C-alpha cells in the first residue's frame, strides 16, 4: 500500500498550476446555432450507435430492429440494408478502407460484413468470437485488424482472416463500456465500472497509462484529434478531460444542473468544441478551453444514443432512441 | 441524374421492404425472460424464440452479473421473472427485483412473477399454508406499472396477462383510468 501512496504523492507533486487561469484571457466562441440540415428516417426501433465512413458521406446505423442500414447522408438514400441475425447489437463500425462493417452486442459474437462482394448482396465475411461478455465498441483498426472491448473486464485485438485474438488486454477490473482509438491508430483508451480510464499501446499489449479522476463509471470516451488528450463522460454528469504526457487531469466541464449520466461525447476537427449527449432530452455543446456552454442541440424527444462528428468536421450525426438520425451542421 | 434516379428507385424498394418488415414487427408483442423456466419456454447464449398462439405472435428473449443492457429493453410488453424457490438465493432474487424496480428505465414495463417448480417444493416438503406464507413474503417484498403474481397452462397465463397489460396501456393512452 506504500507503493501507491508514493506514486500518488509523486503525481500530485508534478502539478504546478491549472490551465483555467491561462484560459480566461483567451477569446471565446459566443454562440453556435447548429440547426438541423438533414434527417434520416426508416428505422423501426431505437438507434444504438453509428459511425461515419472515412469519406464523411456514408454512414451506418444499427437499432433494436434487428437490421443495420447504411445511408448516403447527402441524399438520404439507403445505400444498404443488412438483416442482422440477432436483434441485440449495441455498437457499429465502418472500416477506413470502406469495405467492411462491424456489429456486436448481447450475441457475444462479433460479426464482420463484406460490402464489396462479387454479388450485390452482403454477407457475414467473418463471425468471430472469443469473448465471455457483451461487446461495447468494435472500432476498426485496419483492413484485417479490429479492436473490441467486451464486458469481461478485458479487451482484445482480433485478426480478421485468422480469427484468433492476436493480443489480449486484461488490465482492468470492471467491464469496459466505451472504447476509442487514436487517429494515428497506435494507442487506444477505454473506461469501465471502476472509473479508471486506461490507455493501451497496441504493440505493447498491456496497460500503458491509467487515470482515476472520476467516481462512478466511464460510460463514454473519445479522443482528441491532436492525439495527446481524450475526453470522457460518466454517470456523474462530468466531462473530465485528460492529457497524455502529463498523466494528470486538466479541467472538468461539470454543471450541477445535470444529475443524470452521459451517453456519448465527440470533438470537432479543430478540437475547440466538445459536443456531448445527455439523458435530459438535449445535446449540450461545451468549449474544450473555457468549459462554458456555448449553445444547445435540442431537436429530439428521447435519449440521444450516439452523436458523432465526421472526419472533415462538416456535420455531426446524432442517432437518437426515437428511430431517427439527425445530421446537424 | 440517371444513376441518381436509379439509386432513388432502389432506395424506394428498400423502403418498401422496410415497410413490410414493420408490418411484421408491430404484430410480434415481444417478451423478456428474467431469472423450470426451460420447460416453460420449450413447451451466456440468448435463446430468442418465436411462438404463435391463437393466431397471435410472441417473441421470447431467454436470458449473473448486473449490467446496463437491461436499460435498452425499454419496449418489452412484459418481463417474466421466474424463480425456483427450492431454498439466501431467494434474497438474491429479491435484490434483483429491487434493482429492476429501481432501474428507473424499466418503469412502465409490466413484470409478471412466476412461482414454478411446485413439484420440487412438494418433494422438499399446513405445508400448503407454509408455501403460501413464503409466497406472501415474496409479494410483501415485491411491494417495494403493475406486477402480475402467478402461482399454480402457463402460456395461457401469459396470454391473459399480456392482454390485460396492453388493454391497460391503451386505456391509459386515451385517459380512461
Amino acid at each position, epitope marked *: 500500500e506504500q507503493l501507491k501512496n508514493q506514486i500518488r504523492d509523486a503525481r500530485k507533486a508534478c502539478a504546478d498550476a491549472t490551465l483555467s487561469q491561462i484560459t480566461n484571457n483567451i477569446d471565446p466562441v459566443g454562440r453556435i446555432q447548429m440547426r438541423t440540415r438533414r434527417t434520416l428516417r426508416g428505422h423501426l426501433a431505437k438507434i444504438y450507435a453509428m459511425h461515419w465512413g472515412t469519406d464523411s458521406r456514408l454512414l451506418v446505423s444499427a437499432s433494436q430492429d434487428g437490421k443495420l442500414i447504411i445511408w448516403d447522408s447527402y441524399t438520404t*438514400n439507403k445505400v444498404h440494408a443488412i438483416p442482422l441475425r440477432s436483434s441485440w447489437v449495441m455498437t457499429c463500425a465502418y472500416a477506413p478502407s470502406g469495405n467492411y462493417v462491424a456489429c456486436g452486442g448481447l450475441d457475444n459474437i462479433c460479426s464482420i460484413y463484406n460490402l464489396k462482394t462479387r454479388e*450485390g448482396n452482403v454477407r457475414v465475411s467473418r463471425e468471430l468470437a472469443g469473448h465471455t461478455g457483451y461487446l461495447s465498441c468494435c472500432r476498426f483498426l485496419d483492413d484485417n485488424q479490429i479492436v473490441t472491448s467486451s464486458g469481461d473486464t478485458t479487451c482484445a485485438l482480433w485478426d480478421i482472416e485468422t480469427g484468433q485474438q492476436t493480443t489480449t488486454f486484461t488490465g482492468h477490473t470492471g467491464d469496459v463500456m466505451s472504447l476509442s482509438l487514436a487517429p494515428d491508430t497506435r494507442l487506444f483508451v477505454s473506461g469501465a465500472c471502476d472509473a479508471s480510464a486506461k490507455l493501451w499501446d497496441v504493440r505493447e499489449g498491456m496497460c500503458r497509462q491509467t487515470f482515476t479522476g472520476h467516481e462512478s463509471d466511464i460510460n463514454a470516451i473519445c479522443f482528441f484529434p491532436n492525439g495527446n488528450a481524450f475526453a470522457t463522460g460518466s454517470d456523474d454528469a462530468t466531462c473530465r478531460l485528460f492529457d497524455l504526457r502529463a498523466d494528470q487531469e486538466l479541467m472538468t466541464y461539470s454543471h450541477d444542473n445535470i444529475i443524470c449520466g452521459i451517453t456519448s461525447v465527440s470533438f470537432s476537427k479543430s478540437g475547440r468544441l466538445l459536443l456531448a449527449g445527455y439523458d435530459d432530452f438535449n445535446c449540450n455543446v461545451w468549449d474544450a478551453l473555457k468549459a462554458d456552454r456555448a449553445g444547445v442541440l435540442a431537436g429530439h424527444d428521447n435519449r440521444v444514443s450516439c452523436l458523432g462528428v465526421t472526419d472533415d468536421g462538416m456535420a455531426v450525426a446524432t442517432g437518437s432512441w426515437d428511430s431517427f438520425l439527425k445530421i446537424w451542421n | 441524374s440517371a*444513376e*441518381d434516379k436509379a439509386a432513388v428507385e432502389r432506395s424506394k424498394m428498400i423502403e418498401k421492404q422496410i415497410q413490410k418488415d414493420k408490418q411484421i414487427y408491430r404484430a410480434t408483442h415481444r417478451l423478456l425472460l428474467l431469472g423450470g423456466k426451460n420447460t416453460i419456454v420449450k413447451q451466456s447464449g440468448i435463446f430468442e424464440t418465436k411462438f404463435q398462439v391463437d393466431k397471435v405472435n410472441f417473441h421470447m428473449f431467454d436470458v449473473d452479473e448486473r449490467r446496463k443492457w437491461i436499460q435498452c429493453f425499454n419496449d418489452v410488453t412484459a418481463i417474466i421473472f421466474v424463480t425456483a424457490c427450492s431454498s439466501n438465493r431467494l434474497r438474491a432474487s429479491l435484490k434483483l427485483f429491487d434493482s429492476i424496480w429501481n432501474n428507473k428505465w424499466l418503469r412502465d414495463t409490466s413484470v409478471i412473477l412466476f412461482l414454478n417448480k411446485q413439484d420440487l417444493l412438494a418433494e422438499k416438503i399446513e405445508v400448503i399454508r407454509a408455501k403460501y406464507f413464503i409466497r406472501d413474503e415474496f409479494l410483501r417484498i415485491s411491494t417495494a406499472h403493475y406486477c402480475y403474481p402467478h402461482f399454480t397452462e402457463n402460456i395461457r397465463r401469459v396470454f391473459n396477462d399480456c392482454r390485460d397489460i396492453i388493454q391497460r396501456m391503451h386505456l391509459r393512452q386515451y385517459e380512461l383510468l
Partner: single-chain antibody, 230 residues
C-alpha cells in the same frame, strides 16, 4: 456468376422470336439489366433496360414499338421478345447486369451472348488502329458532343475494352475509377469534354478493341471503337 443466353437463329423478315437470359451465381433480383446488340461489322448498340423491381423501363428510341422485355425473379430468367424484325436487326446480342448505388460499378459482368441472323449524344472515336511496341505507354482517346460533367462532380463515362473473341469487359467506370478485376496499368483521364485511357505496360491480354460509353442520358448511346495491334 454466370449469364447464359438462349434463342436466335435464321428467320425470314417480319417474324417473331424470344430470347432468354438465365442468371446463376448472384442475387439478380436487386440487379438492373440491359440488352446490348452488336452487328457483325459494327459496334455495340443499346436495346432496352429493366430496373430491379421492373418498375422503371426504358427503350431504344430507334426501335421501341416492336420490342418487348420482361423478367421473372423466381424463374431466375429475364427475357426479350422481338416482333416484325427487319434486315437491320441482324446482330448478336449481349445480356448485361448493373447495380445502382453510391459507389457501385454498373455493367460489371457481360453475358456470353447468342447470335441471330436472317440529334442526341454521340461520341467520336476517330482513331481505328494504332500499333505499339512493348514497354511503351498507349493512349486511346474519345470525345462527346455534350459535356458529361454533372452537378454532383462525377463524370459519367465508361470504357468497354473487348478481347478479340469473347464478351466485352468493364475497365473504367465514372471517368476516373477502376473496376474490380483490372490491372493497375489502365488509367482514365481527361478534363470533361475529351477523355482518354492510358496503359503503361502492355502484354498479350491487353490486345482488344476499346469502346467509350455515356450514361448521363438513359438512351446510353455508346461510341464506335479502336483496334489494338502488337
Amino acid at each position: 456468376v454466370q449469364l447464359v443466353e438462349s434463342g436466335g437463329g435464321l428467320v425470314q423478315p417480319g417474324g417473331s422470336r424470344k430470347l432468354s437470359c438465365s442468371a446463376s451465381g448472384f442475387a439478380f433480383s436487386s440487379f438492373g439489366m440491359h440488352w446490348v446488340r452488336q452487328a457483325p461489322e459494327k459496334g455495340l448498340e443499346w436495346v432496352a433496360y429493366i430496373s430491379s423491381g421492373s418498375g422503371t423501363i426504358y427503350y431504344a428510341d430507334t426501335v421501341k414499338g416492336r420490342f418487348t422485355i420482361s423478367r421473372d425473379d423466381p424463374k431466375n430468367t429475364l427475357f426479350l421478345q422481338m416482333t416484325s424484325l427487319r434486315s437491320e436487326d441482324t446482330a448478336m446480342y449481349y445480356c448485361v447486369r448493373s447495380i445502382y448505388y453510391y459507389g457501385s460499378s454498373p455493367f460489371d459482368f457481360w453475358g456470353q451472348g447468342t447470335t441471330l441472323t436472317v440529334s442526341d449524344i454521340v461520341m467520336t472515336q476517330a482513331t481505328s488502329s494504332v500499333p505499339v511496341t512493348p514497354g511503351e505507354s498507349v493512349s486511346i482517346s474519345c470525345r462527346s458532343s455534350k459535356s458529361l460533367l454533372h452537378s454532383n462532380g462525377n463524370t459519367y463515362l465508361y470504357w468497354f475494352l473487348q478481347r478479340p473473341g469473347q464478351s466485352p469487359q468493364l475497365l473504367i467506370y465514372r471517368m476516373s475509377n477502376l473496376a474490380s478485376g483490372v490491372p493497375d496499368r489502365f488509367s482514365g483521364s481527361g478534363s470533361g469534354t475529351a477523355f482518354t485511357l492510358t496503359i503503361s505496360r502492355l502484354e498479350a491480354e491487353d490486345v482488344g478493341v476499346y469502346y467509350c460509353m455515356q450514361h448521363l442520358e438513359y438512351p446510353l448511346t455508346f461510341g464506335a471503337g479502336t483496334k489494338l495491334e502488337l
